[PDB]
Design a protein around this ligand. Structure first.
Ligand code: NA
Lengths: 267, 216
């Protein structure tokens, strides 16, 4: 299974956060689909899930603000969270979740229908032993107990996660400037080029080079955040034209910036 | 936020073993079916163990889980640099009511090769200078361990005003990256002979220099 989260990068405080998870891939089983988040610097937090019978379960701390629904026909599961605050800024992951009530027998007990040599009538017992001494040829000849229910949860497959920032600051598209080191390092065997993705809000941006034709030798660095609250980051490549492709989903803007070596000086 | 108690950090050397404990209560860990997850910077979270002891798809036998009552343990043997990550345990809480994660453990793998930083210094673009602004960008890559200090110079004077430097961030390879930005007026850029970014890592300094007489 592949899971892809979609939704807003920036949500106004006090509004409803709504995300969608789209499941794709070659098959699906009985797994529930759920949501987990992780705030920067903090631990993973369960949000909730929906299973194939339509049962929802929520983190009791968030139950009153959460709604998880699905649409089988679109292979989609949704999450809405009401009245968000900055404390809800996080990476949000959807995930397939194993959720299963197991029937467990105690130590020493059998559960199959192989009753043992010369024995029969063990099949309708959950958990049984033929331990009295002789053959067991009736259900009442076995030691027996009803199975105990034991509940298993775990996350099977995870999405990549979608960053969600809850802030009252405005969406701000980046200014993209071309970088070149050649006027400094004088190297002509290699050229090192880059793009400065200046002064934007919120995270993230995506950067590619030559529309994905140039991947090796690309290094996109983590953003710095100034006290002003705007982000800047840079991407470099070591090497024909070279163009950095900067997408900022939050502003519906894409810039493809030509990066010329510009090794010279104009006085 | 965290419910199950884990050590905030553990370390072991290359080729050796480390154990991470996960301490809960009768309501979570004590009910069994503990799972474990590995989070590495480039990647989605990866399930390692479920059912206390079972390895997930693609997980090698040097990852092993156990549990005794309210405490579960992940052991990682034959440690490799690629095992550096944050590890989290988890379980159902009050069965189908809830799930809870641990507080997380950062694993450091000791004995890795020291790697000095690569430094690239970019001058301001013509385009930014046309708005009377100048940003110098110093990009620092492929260093290990993950601690640098960055000094900016102009014509031999240390500059601290309007410098912003990132923390070191762990790359795709256990090595680290950082960046530093010096924000000037176009006026200030043109008024100096040279600017330098001086990066110190384990007692060794790499310096790159750009000159307004040669750049932008
Ligand atoms: Na049976």
């Amino acid at each position: 299974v592949q899971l892809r989260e979609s939704g807003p990068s920036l949500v106004k405080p006090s509004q409803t956060l709504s995300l969608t998870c789209t499941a794709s891939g070659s098959s699906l089983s009985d797994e529930a689909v759920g949501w987990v988040r992780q705030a920067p610097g903090k631990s993973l937090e369960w949000l909730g899930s929906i299973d194939t019978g339509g049962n929802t379960g929520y983190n009791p701390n968030l139950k009153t603000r959460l709604s998880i629904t699905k649409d089988n026909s679109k292979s989609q599961v949704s999450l809405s969270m009401s009245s968000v605050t900055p404390e809800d800024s996080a990476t949000y992951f959807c995930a397939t979740v194993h959720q299963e009530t197991h029937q467990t027998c105690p130590d020493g007990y059998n559960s199959g229908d192989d009753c043992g040599r010369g024995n029969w009538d063990c099949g309708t017992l959950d958990c049984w032993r033929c331990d009295w001494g002789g053959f067991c040829r009736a259900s009442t000849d076995y030691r027996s107990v009803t199975a105990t229910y034991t509940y298993e949860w775990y996350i099977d497959t995870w999405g990549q996660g979608l960053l969600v920032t809850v802030s009252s600051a405005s969406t701000t598209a980046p200014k993209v400037y071309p970088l070149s080191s050649c006027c400094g390092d004088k190297s002509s065997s290699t050229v090192t080029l880059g793009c400065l993705v200046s002064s934007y809000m919120p995270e993230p941006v995506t950067v590619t080079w030559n529309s994905g034709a140039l991947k090796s030798g690309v290094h996109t660095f983590p953003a710095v955040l100034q006290s002003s609250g705007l982000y800047s980051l840079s991407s470099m490549v070591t090497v024909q034209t070279f163009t950095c492709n900067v997408a900022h989903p939050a502003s519906s803007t894409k810039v493809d910036k030509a990066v010329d070596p510009r090794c010279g000086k104009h006085h | 936020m965290g419910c199950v108690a884990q050590p905030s950090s553990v370390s072991g050397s290359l080729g050796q073993r480390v154990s991470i404990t996960c301490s809960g209560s009768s309501s979570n860990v004590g009910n069994g079916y503990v799972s474990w997850y590995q989070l590495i910077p480039g990647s989605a979270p990866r399930t390692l163990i479920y059912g206390d002891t079972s390895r997930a798809s693609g997980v090698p036998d040097r990852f092993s889980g156990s549990r005794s009552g309210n405490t579960a343990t992940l052991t990682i043997s034959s440690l490799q640099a690629e095992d550096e990550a944050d590890y989290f345990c988890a379980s159902a809480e009050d069965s189908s009511s809830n799930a809870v994660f641990g507080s997380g453990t950062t694993l450091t793998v000791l004995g890795q090769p020291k790697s000095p930083p690569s430094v690239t210094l970019f001058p301001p673009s013509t385009e930014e200078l046309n708005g009377n602004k100048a940003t110098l960008v110093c990009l620092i890559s492929d260093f290990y361990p993950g601690s640098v200090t960055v000094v900016w110079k102009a014509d031999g004077s240390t500059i601290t005003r309007n410098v912003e430097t990132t923390r070191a961030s762990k790359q795709s390879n256990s090595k680290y990256a950082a960046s530093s930005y010096l924000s000037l007026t176009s006026s200030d850029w043109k008024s100096k002979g040279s600017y330098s970014c001086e990066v110190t890592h384990e007692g060794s300094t790499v310096t790159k220099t750009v000159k307004p007489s040669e750049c932008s």
